[PDB]
Amino acid sequence: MRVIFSEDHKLRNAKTELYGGELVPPFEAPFRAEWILAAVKEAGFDDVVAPARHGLETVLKVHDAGYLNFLETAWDRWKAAGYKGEAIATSFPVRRTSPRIPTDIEGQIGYYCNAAETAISPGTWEAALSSMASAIDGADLIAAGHKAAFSLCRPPGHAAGIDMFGGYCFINNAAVAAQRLLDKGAKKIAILDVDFHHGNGTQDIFYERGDVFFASLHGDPAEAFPHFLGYAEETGKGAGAGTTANYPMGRGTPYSVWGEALTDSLKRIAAFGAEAIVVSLGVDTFEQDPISFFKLTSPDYITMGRTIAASGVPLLVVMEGGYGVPEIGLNVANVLKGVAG
């Protein structure tokens, strides 16, 4: 399969991240893509290509315009206000609050933010557009008839909802790709989020869309970021009822239990009638991944890929989470390999 990757991801290099009550160097760092790209290259998938330029039409079909407009200038406004640090939200529209949008930059960032553990820094916007571009190109390859393709996206995007950034995500790539596929002739598309964390952004974007089915395998939100979405009972709403399938799982879940979930989701997706599947690939489910509590081993990522591919429909793998350890590349490369069959 072809690999779409943009060097512009490096433009996203924030120096701080709120964690454990401290500002530390962001976990979703640049070296992540370097290794992923290297591990997959040696896996035989060395047909890497840069993405082409794209407008904002596709993304404007899945994200709020005010939200996008906010991102493009957030940093400039932030620095203009005179802040010495990076842009980090402090106040949030939580329970029983007004729906109005603040005019001030300090209020807007909070309004368009679901988690303070992510900071907007110089380049973030341009970086996000490029990662989005990789997703669009990957989607185009599926639309052209390619059986599979991998968009090495960075920054990731499954936590970016309709009008909010966080969880290290700004533009929901997986969602723009799903939208792209539709725009190219698909009537029904499915998104499968295997990343450790619930793809709360993706869920929100398609909760009321009946043309897209969302399935996510993640850690019980009762005790894992994002904490406020991902419960089994969230099955959709209104025009999108029945189109969301969450599979929350407790600590120590092994592939035995995890794989059963994968099986069930694939069933619901098949019953949904998806013409293709956008795979939100996050390899943070690895037993040796710092911020995660599932017990998956590297071999399992080969099973994961093969299994999803066995669906018989075209697949577009989109990069999401997975950090720290040097096995990230290997694990990602194994999912691609399993997909290759």
Q: Binding to Zn ion by residue 180, rule CB under 5 A?
A: no
> Interface residues for a copy of itself in 217-246 (CB under 8 A)?
221-231, 234
Among the listed residues 8, 17, 140, 195, the single contact to K ion using CB under 5 A = 195
Which residues, 6 or more positions from 194, have their beta carbon under 8 angstroms from its beta carbon?
Answer: 217, 262, 279, 280, 281, 282, 285, 304
Give min distance, CB of 209 to Zn ion, in A.
Answer: 23
Query: Which segment (2-10, 149-157, 159-167, 323-331) binds a copy of itself by CB under 8 A?
Result: 159-167
User: What is the CA 245 to chain-centroid distance, rounded?
Assistant: 16
Q: Residue 122's CB: how many other CB atoms inside 10 A?
A: 18
Measured CA to CA, the distance from residue 204 to residue 164 in angstroms comes to 10
Among the listed residues 163, 193, 204, 284, the single contact to Zn ion using CB under 5 A = 284
Among the listed residues 97, 267, 273, 341, the single contact to a copy of itself using CB under 8 A = 97
Q: Binding to K ion by residue 216, rule CB under 5 A?
A: yes
Look up residue 312 and give its two tokens.
């018989």
Q: Binding to Zn ion by residue 197, rule CB under 5 A?
A: yes
Measured CA to CA, the distance from residue 119 to residue 26 in angstroms comes to 9
Look up residue 271 and give its two tokens.
């019953």
* Total residues at interface with K ion (CB under 5 A): 4
Q: Binding to K ion by residue 160, rule CB under 5 A?
A: no
Query: Which segment (156-164, 186-194, 294-302, 317-325) binds a copy of itself by CB under 8 A?
Result: 156-164
* Total residues at interface with a copy of itself (CB under 8 A): 59
Strands in 300-341 per DSSP E: 315-319
Collapsed DSSP state (helix, strand, coil) of residue 208: coil
The residue assigned the tokens 């368009």 is 112
Contact 336, 1 (CB under 8 A): yes
The residue assigned the tokens 């512009």 is 8
Binding site for a copy of itself (CB under 8 A): 16, 18-23, 78, 82-98, 100, 102-104, 106-107, 110-111, 113-117, 119, 161-164, 166, 200, 204, 207, 221-231, 234
Binding site for Na ion (CB under 5 A): 206, 209, 212, 240, 243
